[PDB]
Amino acid sequence: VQKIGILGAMREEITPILELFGVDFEEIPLGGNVFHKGVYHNKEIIVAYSKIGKVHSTLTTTSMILAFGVQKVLFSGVAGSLVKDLKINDLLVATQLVQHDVDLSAFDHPLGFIPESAIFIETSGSLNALAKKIANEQHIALKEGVIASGDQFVHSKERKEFLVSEFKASAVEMEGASVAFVCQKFGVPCCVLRSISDNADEKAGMSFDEFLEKSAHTSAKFLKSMVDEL
Amino acid sequence: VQKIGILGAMREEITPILELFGVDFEEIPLGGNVFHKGVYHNKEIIVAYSKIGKVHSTLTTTSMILAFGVQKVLFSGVAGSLVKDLKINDLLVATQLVQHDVDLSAFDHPLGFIPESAIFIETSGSLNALAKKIANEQHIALKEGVIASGDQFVHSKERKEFLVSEFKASAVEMEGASVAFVCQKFGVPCCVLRSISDNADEKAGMSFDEFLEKSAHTSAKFLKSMVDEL
Ligand SMILES: Nc1ncnc2c(CN3C[C@H](CCSCCOCCO)[C@@H](O)C3)c[nH]c12
Ligand SMILES: Nc1ncnc2c(CN3C[C@H](CCSCCOCCO)[C@@H](O)C3)c[nH]c12
Known about the structure:
The structure is a homodimer.
Chain A (H helix, E strand, L loop, with lengths): L1 E7 L2 H11 L4 E5 L2 E8 L2 E7 L4 H15 L3 E10 L9 E9 L21 E2 L2 H14 L3 E8 L7 H11 L1 E5 L2 H11 L3 E9 L5 H24 L3
Helix pairs in contact in A: 1-6, 2-5
The structure holds ligand 3QA (2 copies).
Family (chains A, B): Belongs to the PNP/UDP phosphorylase family. MtnN subfamily.
GO cellular component, one term (chains A, B): cytosol
Pathway (chains A, B): Quinol/quinone metabolism; menaquinone biosynthesis; Amino-acid biosynthesis; L-methionine biosynthesis via salvage pathway; S-methyl-5-thio-alpha-D-ribose 1-phosphate from S-methyl-5'-thioadenosine (hydrolase route): step 1/2
């Protein structure tokens, strides 16, 4: 039997996931998260929001894998755009992710690097290829690129410029890299999907509140379309 | 029957732990960590190093709890001092911890705060009381204070002074807050002990390299004395 973990960071990001799947979910509390466990097209689906940021998302992903035995993890949510071609509501799949706020440069380590790890964490090529295939069938744009994750909500030109110069990131959020990292450590295939909610600039807070609902729904709808192919 | 999880961040922090306990350990790999499982004084001890930083430490602490069923978690390692009275080799027990690099100020949150959490994460009062009691009996100085944790190695006066002014922190490291946080989420008693390796200033890299071994041993020796009373 196939077991698939579906994650968002905020409750608002999983609201449309639960609604779009529409099946009956059993609620299972563990480690301060609530896991929604259902069956859909012969697959067991386990849905949770982690809460915001790297520690929360690391915890929840580890719980998904260890406690619920998922074989794939699909993340859905919203993100800040760092590139002109990614506009509000546009979808991006992360081919690599970085923890942009990691700094061990005192020991001459490059920014983003931690010993016994790597700057860039890879996601599943087979899932990313699937995303590309179905986006083409749907005639919807889907960009591929690097996503930068850190424990700050980015809302300045200066920090955007750093993310582009240092990591060639296309989008910024606070959980993708930690989710992808956990999945790498456990050998679990991962896809990270984001819809743009803001431009990570001085107006980001306002844009985020305006577009969270729609952008979350766009990501969630696409995630469902991926699960339909598994 | 009592099962105690014992964590460091770096391999060097657990070397003296394994040595001082002296017992045979079984090595169990899981999620990119190696867990050393042994029996000491009729208690079961599970020792691991997480690897550096908040994501690594969150993962490992969650694995310790879920996969190995530990009832308490004790963290031992080194830290940078932020206060004049904490000198190289001095011991500190963290009564609260903060993630000092968290910034959701774009939405008017205070620094360190994440929704559905708190700036300050509590450790176990009963374990901190035990530490104080033993330290007094041993005639060893043990400070109680706030530890700030983040994904940067701190090596500047400016950042030191921020940690003191913002959080009234006494020491800085990269894992304590995340370990204590996971333990809080699962309702597992936690104690975080650190020995000072450096002063978190421009000389910190050199001080760290010089004193890592001795400071790690000092922390490990004290952690063993706690386990002897559990
Ligand atoms: N520009 C940007 N920089 C960094 N990340 C993002 C993201 C992605 N998510 C949104 C969410 C923000 C949490 S704060 C809002 C809620 O606070 C109020 C609720 O109490 C966190 O999970 C990261 C969208 N735009 C971003
Ligand atoms: N001032 C300071 N700021 C933040 N943290 C600390 C700590 C506590 N630990 C040491 C270690 C980082 C060292 S990276 C060594 C270079 O990598 C060598 C392996 O390639 C990480 O686990 C945090 C001591 N002094 C500190």
